[PDB]
Design a protein around this nucleic acid. Structure first.
Ligand code: MG
Ligand code: MG
Ligand code: MG
Ligand code: MG
Ligand code: MG
Ligand code: MG
Ligand code: MG
Ligand code: MG
Ligand code: MG
Ligand code: MG
Ligand code: MG
Ligand code: MG
Ligand code: MG
Ligand code: MG
Ligand code: MG
Ligand code: MG
Ligand code: MG
Ligand code: MG
Ligand code: MG
Ligand code: MG
Ligand code: MG
Ligand code: MG
Ligand code: MG
Ligand code: MG
Ligand code: MG
Ligand code: MG
Ligand code: MG
Ligand code: MG
Ligand code: MG
Ligand code: ZN
Lengths: 111, 49, 154, 101, 116, 144, 53
RNA sequence: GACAAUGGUAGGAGAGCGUUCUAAGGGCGUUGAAGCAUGAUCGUAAGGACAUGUGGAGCGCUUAGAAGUGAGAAUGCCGGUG
RNA sequence: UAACUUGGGAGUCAGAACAUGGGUGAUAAGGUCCGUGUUCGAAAGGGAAACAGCCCAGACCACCAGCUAAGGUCCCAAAAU
RNA sequence: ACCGAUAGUGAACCAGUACCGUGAGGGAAAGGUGAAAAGCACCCCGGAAGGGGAGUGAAAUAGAACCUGAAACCGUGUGCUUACAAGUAGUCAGAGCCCGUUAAUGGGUGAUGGCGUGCCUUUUGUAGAAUGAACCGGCGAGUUACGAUUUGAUGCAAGGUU
């Protein structure tokens, strides 16, 4: 049985989010929580909340046992980009992309 | 005759040529005007005589 | 066209030095919202043919009806008042097809009113005959007086 | 035992009970075709034709008259705005050898 | 009446992209690159259908030469010998016999040698 | 109809041969060995596979040259460093490294392809009359 | 100064082979059993070397 | 049946494909239109089907008529994204 | 087996090499300007390692058939150690 | 036999607005839930955002710039393949492996061999180290009117035609 949580339009670039997701993918939930807590990156706390929400929906909605759960799927899809500009020298403006991520976590009992 | 079976007299109608509609037609690109010179320009050419 | 589209008087940027394509107006055809090159312009599509050919065309359409047995001659149409149902009944007794062209010598209001709402049925005068109406109809129901009038005219 | 037979401007090495694909022959499906020209007969008894073994024939049954997979023939000359695209499907006759000689 | 670009443009380009399936990177993705590659693929295929005939003829001769040398004869003499004998087995069939049936090939060699 | 046999690793059989280099011209021995290594002497020769046989050359020190090649035939190698051209004569190469002289001669007659490099690796050359590949049970081959 | 050619997806991804973050050097805390960074005070229980910090 | 021709730029000539709209006829569609996606399909080419998924209300076909009728390139224009 | 006439529609008016008859230049130029022929242009295929213009030869499509041209036949690399 | 949201007015929308300029003046972008709002009670994670259920609905993979939802582009997983090799990336030949179709002398991949210097423009001649294009999408160039001439078609004809 699989339980899923998604955090949509998180204001962090997918590339940055994906580095942390690479750490936790395919690991037991308990270990994944530990990695997220002890990893010093901006995406880690947001990812942790997605994982915690996924584990909660496993226990509540599907009555799965939390201890046996594994992080089957972890991935970040691109959200819509916030388009901004930075004034440069000589009256020129250079564009700034403030990118967003859709973070999905799937947890599985392996059954 | 019938409005669903109309036919013009044979030889009465020919389809117009359309230039600048691809290489295969033989009138693509330069559109029969050749390369450069006054004659290949829009509104180009000399007065008669 | 480029002249008709609003604005676009000034040159967008200098001819040289910017690294951009040279442009003379923002309403040029390859611009979004620019003028159209050689689009439709208001004109008539009507043309003429010699009178003898017009007459030949009418006679050819009428003859095709006669050859296909699409010609029915009736003595007269008598309608004191306009009644669609009565006219519909008449057509059924006459065993007429769905598409019928009814011809009268002169305009008859009651006949025209009676057949106006019936799909496939068209009512015309003898002078009003035109090849399109004749060709479209499967059959023609003509009054004796109308038929004689048509013969004289053509 | 094998036989060398000549058909469709080519030579084919055949054995009994073998399916062959040859240039289209003028025969209907289910008909029996005899290959008249046998260049060589193999096996324990070897016969060499000069150029054909005399009185040697191969009998085959026509299985299918078909067209090969479409070949798209495309050629172009760069910078000349010249190209040609043609489709081709080569006709073929499929047969099965019944008997040699 | 106005005719908008519509669906014809997508349909045509998609056919080209499908023809360039299996090509590397952008060549299997973008219309302009794939079109060029599909054009190159046509020209190459046309050339290679002709080349294939030259290549297989070359292989058959190479194999016959080896087979002849085992019978202490050059390819050049073997083929000249076969011609004088009147044997019209082609190089493909000769090559196949040499591989499949050595005894049969040996008999052909003797015929060629006798003709010379 | 397509009927051409194609050799593959399953059906290919590679033999071991010993060729004596004593009293043989380098190039004439070299050209013959190159054909054996490439499977040109097999009826099952197939271009895209290695149908060739392993070749052992012995007595490479006793290989011969004609004319004044011993002094006048020079091998040049560059180190890819500026002015990095180094030369040794064919005669000196024969004295110092006869195996290299034979090996380079044959490899220069092999195709510069992945297959060609592989076919060159099947050549084993020895300056003396003794080789260490007795287990391979090599067969003596006489050059034509 | 400037790239002569655009970088392909393949080339870019080959370059990103070593662009990754390692797992934190973490071990289970003896007192509470929660993972802690090695040589650091346990954040959960505030204990280091079997003593409260 | 026989045999003759069939490289090609500028360029001339011919025959066609497909797009939108109109007329007439004849059809399809909530028991699923168009569009979109996928496929190992068909035609000498432009191109045409069919099946399935998606979609959710329009749309083919035949003959004729009429065109804002076909894009890869214009340091093209606008948008999106590298 | 073309030719000519009349009428509708063109494009072209920067040419190149090679060979050969000449002018110019210096019996210089991948020079330049005229005569002649060929090829390229607008021509793929084979040869000349590569190589518009040289040599052989003019590709309707298909074939894992055959004979030849120029050029070749010890190995690369098909064919004479 | 006019447009159908890059079209059609600059403007289908709070547009001569926003924005730009001292000013004259220049001047955009931006339509679509559903039949009905029935617009997600309640529960759970979270500060919120967002999500998982439950429920509404024919449909929520119709949940608010909410019909459809192409491509570039970014990810995740997976069958085959790859760390001695010199690549206009294909093409032709071809084992092994993995599959099984509009059932077709099938599909995916590809050890290894042969051959092979993009396209367009402009040129005597361009792999060109000449030009042009980041990519994808849309948009973007012989038209119409009135005369002339010629050809085809058709009616009538020493007449033809308004
Ligand atoms: Mg400033
Ligand atoms: Mg035409
Ligand atoms: Mg042309
Ligand atoms: Mg073009
Ligand atoms: Mg031009
Ligand atoms: Mg010029
Ligand atoms: Mg001109
Ligand atoms: Mg620039
Ligand atoms: Mg406009
Ligand atoms: Mg329209
Ligand atoms: Mg378009
Ligand atoms: Mg040939
Ligand atoms: Mg020809
Ligand atoms: Mg032609
Ligand atoms: Mg023309
Ligand atoms: Mg257009
Ligand atoms: Mg574009
Ligand atoms: Mg001359
Ligand atoms: Mg050889
Ligand atoms: Mg419209
Ligand atoms: Mg739209
Ligand atoms: Mg608008
Ligand atoms: Mg506007
Ligand atoms: Mg390896
Ligand atoms: Mg290859
Ligand atoms: Mg030119
Ligand atoms: Mg370069
Ligand atoms: Mg220029
Ligand atoms: Mg550029
Ligand atoms: Zn602790």
């Amino acid at each position: 049985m699989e339980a899923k949580a998604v955090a949509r339009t998180i204001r962090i670039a997918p590339r940055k989010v994906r580095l942390v997701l690479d750490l936790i993918r395919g690991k037991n939930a308990a270990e994944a929580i530990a990695i997220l807590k002890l990893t010093n990156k901006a995406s880690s706390p947001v990812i942790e909340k997605v994982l915690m929400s996924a584990l909660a929906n496993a226990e509540h909605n599907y009555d799965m046992n939390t201890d046996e759960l594994v992080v089957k799927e972890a991935y970040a899809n691109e959200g819509p980009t916030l388009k901004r500009f930075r004034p440069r020298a000589q009256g020129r403006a250079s564009a700034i992309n403030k990118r967003t991520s859709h973070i999905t976590i799937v947890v599985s009992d392996g059954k | 005759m019938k409005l669903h079976e109309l036919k013009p007299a044979e030889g009465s109608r020919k389809e117009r040529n359309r230039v600048g509609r691809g290489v295969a037609t033989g009138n693509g690109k330069t559109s029969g005007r050749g390369h450069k010179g006054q004659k290949a320009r829009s509104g180009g050419g000399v007065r008669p005589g | 066209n480029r002249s008709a589209v609003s604005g676009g008087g000034r040159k967008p940027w200098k001819q040289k030095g910017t690294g951009r394509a040279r442009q003379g107006t923002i309403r040029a055809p390859q611009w979004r919202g620019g003028g159209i090159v050689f689009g439709p312009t208001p004109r008539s599509y009507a043309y003429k043919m010699p009178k003898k050919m017009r007459r030949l065309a009418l006679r050819s359409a009428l003859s095709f009806k006669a050859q296909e047995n699409g010609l029915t001659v009736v003595d007269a149409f008598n309608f004191e008042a306009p009644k669609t149902k009565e006219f519909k009944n008449v057509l059924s007794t006459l065993e007429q097809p769905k598409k019928v062209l009814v011809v009268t010598e002169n305009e008859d209001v009651n006949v025209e009113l009676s057949a106006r709402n019936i799909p496939g049925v068209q009512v015309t005068t003898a002078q009003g005959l035109n090849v399109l109406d004749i060709t479209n109809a499967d059959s023609l129901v003509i009054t004796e007086a109308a038929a004689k009038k048509v013969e004289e005219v053509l | 035992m094998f036989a060398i037979i000549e058909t469709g401007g080519k030579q084919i090495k055949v054995e009994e009970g073998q399916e062959i694909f040859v240039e289209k022959l003028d025969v209907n499906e289910g008909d029996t075709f005899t290959f008249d020209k046998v260049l060589f007969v193999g096996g324990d008894s070897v016969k060499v034709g000069a150029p054909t073994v005399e009185g040697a024939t191969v009998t085959a049954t026509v299985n299918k008259q078909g067209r090969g997979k479409k070949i798209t023939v495309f050629t172009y000359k760069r910078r000349k705005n010249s190209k040609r695209k043609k489709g081709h499907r080569q006709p073929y006759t499929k047969l099965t050898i019944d008997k040699i000689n | 009446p106005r005719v908008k670009g519509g669906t014809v443009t997508r349909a045509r380009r998609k056919k080209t992209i499908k023809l360039a399936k299996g090509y590397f990177g952008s060549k299997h993705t973008l219309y302009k690159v794939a079109k060029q590659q599909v054009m190159k693929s046509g020209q190459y295929a046309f050339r290679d259908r002709r080349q294939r005939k030259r290549d297989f003829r070359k292989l058959w001769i190479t194999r016959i030469n080896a087979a002849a040398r085992q019978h202490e004869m050059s390819y050049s003499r073997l083929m000249n010998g076969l011609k004088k004998a009147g044997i019209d087995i082609n190089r493909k069939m000769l090559s196949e016999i040499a591989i499949s049936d050595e005894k049969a090939f040996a008999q052909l060699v003797t015929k060629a040698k006798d003709a010379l | 109809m397509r009927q051409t046999f194609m050799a593959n690793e399953s059906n290919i059989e590679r033999k071991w041969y010993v060729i004596d280099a004593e009293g043989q011209t380098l190039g004439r021995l070299s050209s013959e060995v190159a054909s054996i290594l490439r499977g040109k002497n097999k009826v099952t020769y197939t271009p895209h596979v290695d149908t060739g046989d392993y070749v052992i050359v012995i007595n490479a020190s006793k290989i011969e040259f004609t004319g004044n090649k011993e002094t006048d035939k020079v091998y040049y190698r560059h180190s890819n460093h500026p002015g990095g051209i180094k030369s040794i004569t064919a005669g000196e190469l024969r004295r110092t490294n006869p195996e290299r002289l034979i090996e380079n001669s044959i490899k220069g007659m092999l195709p510069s392809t992945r297959l060609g490099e592989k076919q060159g690796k099947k050549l084993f050359v020895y300056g003396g009359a003794e080789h260490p590949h007795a287990a391979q049970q090599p067969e003596n081959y006489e050059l034509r | 100064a400037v790239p002569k050619r655009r970088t392909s997806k393949t080339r870019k991804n080959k370059r990103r082979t070593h662009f990754k973050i390692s797992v934190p050097g973490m071990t289970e805390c003896p007192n509470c059993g929660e993972y802690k960074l090695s040589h650091r005070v346990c954040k959960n229980c505030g204990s280091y070397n079997g003593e409260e910090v």
